[PDB]
Amino acid sequence: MRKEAIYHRPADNFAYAYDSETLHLRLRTKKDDIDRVELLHGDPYDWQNGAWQFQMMPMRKTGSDELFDYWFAEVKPPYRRLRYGFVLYSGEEKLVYTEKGFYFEVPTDDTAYYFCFPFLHRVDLFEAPDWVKDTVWYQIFPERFANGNPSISPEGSRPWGSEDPTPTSFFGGDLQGIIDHLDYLVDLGITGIYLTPIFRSPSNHKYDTADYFEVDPHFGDKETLKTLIDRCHEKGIRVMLDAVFNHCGYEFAPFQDVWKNGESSKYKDWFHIHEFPLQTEPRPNYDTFAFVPQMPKLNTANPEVKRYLLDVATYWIREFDIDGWRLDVANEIDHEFWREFRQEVKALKPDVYILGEIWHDAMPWLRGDQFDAVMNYPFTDGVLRFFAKEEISARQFANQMMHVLHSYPNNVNEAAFNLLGSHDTSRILTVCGGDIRKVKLLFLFQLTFTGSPCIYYGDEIGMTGGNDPECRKCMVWDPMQQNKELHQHVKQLIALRKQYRSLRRGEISFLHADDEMNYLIYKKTDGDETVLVIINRSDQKADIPIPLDARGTWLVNLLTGERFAAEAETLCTSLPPYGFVLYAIEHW
Amino acid sequence: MRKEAIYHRPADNFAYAYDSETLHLRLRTKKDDIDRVELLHGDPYDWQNGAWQFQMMPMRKTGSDELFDYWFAEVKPPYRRLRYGFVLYSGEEKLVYTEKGFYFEVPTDDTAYYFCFPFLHRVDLFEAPDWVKDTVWYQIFPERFANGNPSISPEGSRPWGSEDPTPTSFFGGDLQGIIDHLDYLVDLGITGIYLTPIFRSPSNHKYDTADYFEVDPHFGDKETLKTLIDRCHEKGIRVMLDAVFNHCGYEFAPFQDVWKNGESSKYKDWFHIHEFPLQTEPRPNYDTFAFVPQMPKLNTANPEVKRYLLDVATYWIREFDIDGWRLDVANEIDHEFWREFRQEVKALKPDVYILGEIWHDAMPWLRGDQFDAVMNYPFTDGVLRFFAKEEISARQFANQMMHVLHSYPNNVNEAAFNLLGSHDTSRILTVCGGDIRKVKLLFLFQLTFTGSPCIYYGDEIGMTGGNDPECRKCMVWDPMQQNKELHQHVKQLIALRKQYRSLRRGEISFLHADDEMNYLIYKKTDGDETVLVIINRSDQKADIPIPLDARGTWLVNLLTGERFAAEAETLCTSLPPYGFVLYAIEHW
Numbered sequence A, B: 001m002r003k004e005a006i007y008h009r010p011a012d013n014f015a016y017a018y019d020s021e022t023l024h025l026r027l028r029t030k031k032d033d034i035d036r037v038e039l040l041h042g043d044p045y046d047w048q049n050g051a052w053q054f055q056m057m058p059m060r061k062t063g064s065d066e067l068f069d070y071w072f073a074e075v076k077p078p079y080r081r082l083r084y085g086f087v088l089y090s091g092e093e094k095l096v097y098t099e100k101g102f103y104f105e106v107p108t109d110d111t112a113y114y115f116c117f118p119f120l121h122r123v124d125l126f127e128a129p130d131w132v133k134d135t136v137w138y139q140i141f142p143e144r145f146a147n148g149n150p151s152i153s154p155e156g157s158r159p160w161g162s163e164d165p166t167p168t169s170f171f172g173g174d175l176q177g178i179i180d181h182l183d184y185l186v187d188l189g190i191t192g193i194y195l196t197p198i199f200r201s202p203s204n205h206k207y208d209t210a211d212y213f214e215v216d217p218h219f220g221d222k223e224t225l226k227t228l229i230d231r232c233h234e235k236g237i238r239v240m241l242d243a244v245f246n247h248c249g250y251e252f253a254p255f256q257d258v259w260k261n262g263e264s265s266k267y268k269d270w271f272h273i274h275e276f277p278l279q280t281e282p283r284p285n286y287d288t289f290a291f292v293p294q295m296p297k298l299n300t301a302n303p304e305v306k307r308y309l310l311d312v313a314t315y316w317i318r319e320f321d322i323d324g325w326r327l328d329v330a331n332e333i334d335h336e337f338w339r340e341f342r343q344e345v346k347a348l349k350p351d352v353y354i355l356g357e358i359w360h361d362a363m364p365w366l367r368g369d370q371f372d373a374v375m376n377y378p379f380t381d382g383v384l385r386f387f388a389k390e391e392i393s394a395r396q397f398a399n400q401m402m403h404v405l406h407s408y409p410n411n412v413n414e415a416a417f418n419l420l421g422s423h424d425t426s427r428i429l430t431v432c433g434g435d436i437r438k439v440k441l442l443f444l445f446q447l448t449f450t451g452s453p454c455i456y457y458g459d460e461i462g463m464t465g466g467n468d469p470e471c472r473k474c475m476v477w478d479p480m481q482q483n484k485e486l487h488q489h490v491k492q493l494i495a496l497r498k499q500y501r502s503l504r505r506g507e508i509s510f511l512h513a514d515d516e517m518n519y520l521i522y523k524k525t526d527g528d529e530t531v532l533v534i535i536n537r538s539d540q541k542a543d544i545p546i547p548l549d550a551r552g553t554w555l556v557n558l559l560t561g562e563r564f565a566a567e568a569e570t571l572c573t574s575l576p577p578y579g580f581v582l583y584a585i586e587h588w
C-alpha cells in the first residue's frame, strides 16, 4: 500500500455533518491500491475495562478520479462526538491510518491517535435553501431579452437583433419585456430566473454601478420590478438578482466625491487608494476590478461601506421579496463581510439563495457560514471539454467529474449552480462548432446532474455567438429562427428531471464501458430510483454494451416509454451518431 | 514522479496571508521525489495588460516528514491578487501542477487552470497578540501552589504537601499564595501565568462551575485577584484565566433549576436535555462533558446562554484586565459561538490571547476568525516520545516535528502554546523515569522552540507524579527538595530565549547525522541570527560531528559565553550522556 497517497483531514470535504445527527467521512487512497477500507469509530469517552470502545464500518468506494479512489461512510455518533481512524486492507497487508500516522494494528491505549469530530452542532451545519435543489434556473441579460417598453430605451438603441452587440451598443431590452415573455419560460419548465445587474449604471451590462438603491431607468422602475417578481411568484418562479459588491461604478456618488476632493473626501476610505489625487493614466492608483478604471474596488472592511452594502442586500429582499443574490466577483471580498452578509440575509429571509461567482475551487466559501453555492464553472469546463470540443475521453471526463464532486461535501454538491455557459463565456452551440447534436448532449448531462442547473437565455433555441459581447445577442423571438429540436429537447429533459428525483438529488456513478473513449455510461440513484444514461459521443453509430444484471432486470426508456426485459448479460444498446438513451431501472 | 503524493489546495496551511502584503504558499510532494519546484505566479487579470507569461520563483524545501517534502514560497502580489501553478522537476521529467491537473508544459491557451488566491484582505488575516511570541508561561493549579491565606482553606485541608493528592483532596492553595511567590517566578524568568479555573466550584479543580461571576471563596475575593494581576503586570507578567464554557457545574443555579422543575424550568434550553425528568445513570439523559453527571453541556446556540457566557468573557477582562482566556474543551463548542466570542473580546481588548484547549489537529479553529492558538499537545507527544520515553529515533522525531509544523500556517505556529505537560498529563520527570538529565533536554528543546511555551508549576524543580491527580501535588518550596541544578538550567534557558530572537520566532531546521537515532541536531534561524543545537540522547559520551561552514564563522557557546572560530570544517563536539550545547552562529 502507498502511504503517500492515503489522505484525510477532519474538515471540509473529508469530514462534515450531513444533518443534525449524521456525519459523513471520506478517505482517498491510490486508485486500485486498496481492496477494502473500514472506518474505525467510537465515542471519545466510551471506555470499559481501560478499553476505548469502537466499532468497524466498511466504507464504500463512491468513485475515483485520475489518481485516487474515494471511500465513503456515514455514521450517527451515539452522543454526537467522535474519534476515528481508517483500516486499509490489501492482500494480507493491514494498515491503521490515524492522525498520528500509520499503525499495523488498532492501538487502543488512548484516543489521541485518532482524527476527531468533537461535536455535531446544528448551528455549524451546512444548509442551503432546499427549494433550489429542484429548481432549473434561466439566466437573463435584461438589455438583450425583450423590449417591452420602447419609450424608456436609451436613444441610439439598435433595431432588435439588427446586428451583433458591441461593448457599448444598446437594443432596448427592459424588465417589462421579461414579464411579457414569462409564459414562454413557464412552458419551457423554468422555475428560477437569474438577472444580471439591473441597478442604475451607464453601461449595457451595468456591472459598474452608479446607485445600488435605484433600478436603472432604462430597464424600468421599482414598480415594474415589483410586478415582474410578483408575476414570477404567481407562476412558481423564483427571482435572483446580481450583487455587484466588489466594486462600484465611476459614477457612484461616493467615488465621484473622492475623485474631486481627493484625501479630504469623507468617502476616501470607501475605496482602496494608493495615492492622492486619483488618476486613471497611465494606470489607476487605486484597486479596481481587473484593471478597469471605471470600476473602483470597494473597501468592505470599512464600517460605512459594510452598512451600505448590507442595507442594499436587505433592502431588495424586504421591499421586493427577491429569492436570491448572485455575488459578483465574490472571491475578492473578505470572508468577514460574507459571514455578516449571510447572517443578515438569512435572518431576514432564510429561503434566500446566496450564490457566489467563483470560477475556481471554492471550499472556503462553502463551509456553511457564507455562501449556499457558487457558479460551478469547473463543471462547465469539464462538460464542454468532453461534449463540445471532444478533447478528452469518456474515461478522463468521468475522472474530472468525480474529482470535482469529491472535492466538496455531499450537501454542498446538492445545491451547486451547474451552468453550461453565461454572459461571460461563449455560446455553447458556438463552442460545439455549430453541432446541435453536441449541444443536446450538454443539455442531457446538465439536466440529469444533481444540483441546481442554469440555462443561459437563448441556448435552448440555438442562439450563436462567441465570447462577450457576441454571447449577448438580442433574444431570438421569431419562431422560424428558433431551433425547435433543442427547445423541445430542453423542455423534455426539464420535465423528466422533475419526475425523476435521482436526476436532481441522487448520486452519480460512472460505469466503465469498452472503448472508454466515446461511450459515456453513467447512472443516477437516490436509493429509491435508478436512471441509467448511455451516450454515444462519436460520429459513428454504436452498439454500446450495457453492463447490468441478467434475469430480473427491467428497463423503461424515459423518452419513448418503451418497457422491456433484460435478456442475459448481453444487453447491447444501439445508438445513432451522438445518440443517447435514458432508462429507469427495475429489479424484481 | 508520484502524482498521488503531490498536493496543494488554496487554504489553511497551503496558501494564506502572512501579513497585509505577503502570501505564503506550500507544496507537498513525495520525499526525495522532486528535485526542485518553481512557483508560477501572476495577477489573475494580467491578460488585460497583455501579460500572459507567468513570473517564476523557485520554492525552498523547508522540511520532510515520514512521507513528504514541503516546499515554500512567499509572494508579494503587486495588486494583492494571485493566480498560480507549480512546475516540478524530477530530473528530465517536468510537470505543471494546477487546480485543473498535471500537464507537460504550461497550457498555451487562455483557460483557467490555476489555483487562485483572490485577494489579500487585512481583515481576514490571522493575527495573534504579538506579545505572546515573547512570553514564557507558567501554569498554576491554585489549589496546589501555595497556602498564603490559611483562614479560607477548605474545612478539611490536609497538611501542605504532606500526602498524595486525590480526586477530592484539598490543601488550601490560594491566590495570596501566588502573590506571595511572584518573586520566585520573576527570578525564574516567567512573563506569563496561566491559571486553571478559579471561579466558585465545590471541587479542587473547579471545572464544574457553580458561578462564573464569583471568584471561589477558598481561593480569595475580588481585591485579592486585582492585586495579583496588578502585581504581575508591574513585573511584565501577563495573566490568563481558564474559561469553562462547554459545560457548567451541578450547582450552577440555571441547572439546579432544571433538575428541580424539569420540562417546566425557564432554563430547559440552556442545556442538552433528551428527556424529562433528568437522570444521572446508567448515563445522564442530557449531554455532559464525557459522561460526568455533574458537568452538563451548555447550549452555546441558545441566545441567553451565549449572552451570559459572552458577558463572562468580557466581564473579567474589563474589570480585572486579564490578558488571556484558556478555553476549556474548546473543540466541543460550536464555531459560531467562537466567532462572536473573538469579536467581542478583541473589540474590548485586542491584546487578549485566546487559547483553546484542543489536543488534536485544530486548523478549523485557527484560520484567524477564532482562536489565536491551541494547547499544542501533539508537540508534547512527539517531544516526550523522543526525549522521555525514547520510543522514536532522532530521525522520526525530526519528521514528526516537521509534520505537525507544516500542517499549519507560519503565523499560526509562531503563537503556538507549546507545553511539555499539564494538570492532565503525567509529570515529565516521571515520564522520563526519574532521569533529571532527560528533563533538561525537554526544557532545552522547548525553550529553543518557536511559539509561546508553557511550563507546568513544579517541573522546573523536578516534582514527580503520574497522571491526574498525581501530577497535581502541592508545590515544593523547601530548596532541599527542589534540585537547584534543573531550576538554574531552566532559568538559564529562559534567559537565552529572551536574548535570541531565533529561539522564539525563528524557523527550525533539522540536520541529519550518522547516529540519526540518538543524536539530534537542529538550528533556529531568523535573518543571520542563528542558533545551532546539538543533543546527545544516549546513556554515554559521544563525539558528534556537526558540519557547518567555516571561514568567517564564529561560534558562541550560549551556555558559557565562550567564543571561537571553526577549524575542522566539520567540527566535532564531545558530549557526556544526554549532553547538549547551544552555539550562536555568526557570519563575518
Ligand SMILES: OC[C@H]1O[C@H](OC[C@H]2O[C@H](O[C@H]3[C@H](O)[C@@H](O)[C@@H](O)O[C@@H]3CO)[C@H](O)[C@@H](O)[C@@H]2O)[C@H](O)[C@@H](O)[C@@H]1O
Binding pocket: A167, A168, A203, A205, A207, A208, A244, A289, A292, A294, A328, A329, A357, A423, A424, A468
Ligand atoms: O476592458 C474594458 C471594459 O471595461 C468595462 O467593462 C468591464 C467588464 O465588466 C463586466 O464584467 C463583469 C462580469 O460580467 C461579471 O460576471 C463579473 O465577472 O464581474 C465583471 C466585472 O464587474 C462586463 O460584463 C464585461 O463585459 C466587461 O468587459 C466597460 O464597461 C467596458 O465597456 C469596457 O469594454
Ligand SMILES: OC[C@H]1O[C@H](OC[C@H]2O[C@H](O[C@H]3[C@H](O)[C@@H](O)[C@@H](O)O[C@@H]3CO)[C@H](O)[C@@H](O)[C@@H]2O)[C@H](O)[C@@H](O)[C@@H]1O
Binding pocket: B167, B203, B205, B207, B208, B244, B289, B292, B294, B328, B329, B357, B423, B424, B468
Ligand atoms: O468522573 C470522574 C471525575 O468526574 C468529574 O471530574 C471530571 C474531570 O474534570 C476536570 O477535567 C477537566 C480538565 O482538567 C481540563 O483541562 C479539560 O480537559 O476539561 C476537563 C473537563 O472540564 C478535572 O480537572 C479532572 O481531574 C476530572 O477528572 C468530578 O468532578 C470528579 O470528582 C470525578 O473524579
